[PDB]
Amino acid sequence: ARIRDVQGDITEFQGDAIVNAANNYLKLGAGVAGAILRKGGPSIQEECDRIGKIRVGEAAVTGAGNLPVRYVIHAAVLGDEPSLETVRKATKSALEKAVELGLKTVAFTAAWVGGLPAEAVLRVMLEEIKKAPDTLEVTGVHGTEKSAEAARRARLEH
Numbered sequence: 001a002r003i004r005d006v007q008g009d010i011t012e013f014q015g016d017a018i019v020n021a022a023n024n025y026l027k028l029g030a031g032v033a034g035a036i037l038r039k040g041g042p043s044i045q046e047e048c049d050r051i052g053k054i055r056v057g058e059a060a061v062t063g064a065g066n067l068p069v070r071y072v073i074h075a076a077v078l079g080d081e082p083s084l085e086t087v088r089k090a091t092k093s094a095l096e097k098a099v100e101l102g103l104k105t106v107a108f109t110a111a112w113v114g115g116l117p118a119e120a121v122l123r124v125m126l127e128e129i130k131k132a133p134d135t136l137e138v139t140g141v142h143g144t145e146k147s148a149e150a151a152r153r154a155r156l157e158h
Contacts, residue, residue, distance in 0.1 A: 001095075001132035004139040005151040011039045013141060015105030017071040018064070019094045021112050024056045024079035032109050032143075036072065040065035044072060055079075057089030061097050073097045073106070078114055084124055087112055091128040098136055110142040110151070122154040 010018055010032060020036055023029070026048035028037040037045055047062035054060050056079040064072045075090035090112075098106050113121050129138050142148040 002137040007145045010141040013107040016103040019108045022074035024076040040067045059093035095132045107139045
């Protein structure tokens with residue numbers, strides 16, 4: 001996969017889909033998830049409700065309502081807990097949806113951490129992203145330029 005990292009508002013991404021780091025209940029909550037809910041509109045939560053509870057590590061696809069993307073891929077990274085193995089699974093699953101749907105571009109919400117070491121999380125996600133096809137471009141979208149630079153450094157290390 002082609003891998004990018006930029007500073008930005010993920011709700012303004014102009015590509016095929018955004019990957020939303022989710023709870024297994026698929027309830028859109030605070031922060032970025034709340035931006036997606038507000039800008040996208042109620043239809044997103046409504047489809048999430050219809051899909052229902054999923055397993056941690058799995059992903060679910062909904063429409064994106066009024067957002068400038070076509071889909072939101074909800075990757076469930078937390079539920080009734082305790083995981084680095086969980087981030088890997090949710091990342092793998094989200095990328096599988098992107099392939100199945102035949103997407104060319106997706107953005108990840110840079111929440112995936114979950115009290116785990118952030119550098120460790122960046123590393124495991126990069127590993128799964130690299131296994132995705134080169135027909136797919138994956139953009140990590142970061143709230144801060146500092147967060148963006150941390151992702152760039154991890155891709156270098158490596």
